[PDB]
A paper describes a structure:
One central protein involved in the formation of regulatory ribonucleoprotein complexes (RNP) is the coronaviral structural protein nucleocapsid (N). N plays a major role in RNA genome replication, translation, and packaging and has further been found to interfere with host-integrated stress responses and stress granule formation. The N-[name] possesses a peculiar, hand-like three-dimensional fold, with a β-sheet palm and several flexible loops, arranged as fingers around the central β-sheet. The latter, together with the extraordinarily long basic β-hairpin finger, constitutes the positively charged primary RNA-binding surface.
All crystal structures of nat_mutants with WT-like RNA-binding (nat_mutants P67S, A119S, [name] and P151S) superimpose well with the [name] WT with RMSD values between 0.592 and 1.776 Å. Mutated residues in the above-named nat_mutants lie peripheral to the structural core, which further supports both the converging structures and the unaltered apparent RNA-binding affinities. High-resolution crystal structures supported by solution NMR data reveal that all six nat_mutants are overall conservative regarding fold and functionality.
Numbering used by the authors: 47 to 174
Amino acid sequence: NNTASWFTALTQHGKEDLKFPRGQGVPINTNSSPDDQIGYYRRATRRIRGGDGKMKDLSPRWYFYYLGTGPEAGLPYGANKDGIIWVATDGALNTPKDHIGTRNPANNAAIVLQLPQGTTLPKGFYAE
């Protein structure tokens, strides 16, 4: 368990935690099928030495992982845990996606996180 998300991160520049309305939020991946469109975003916080010499938090990043993969590969869909939010497209199956898995940066670039037309990013969220 030393995983890389298949996608680039969503950066939280605002004060609200990430959330999506039911049916929205699964990044587009042409190498996946309708049954696979389900997973979670996990908040990844980073700290840095600021200009004044004090440690400070950077804007949190949220990375998507297919259900049954990634840092919370053992969590069932819908499990309540701080820093974890769930997303699923209509018709997705609630089964682990080991056949998609996570990405190896040695042989695959991250896929730029894109969401379909009818879905906008929540307040304070940016796909950098």
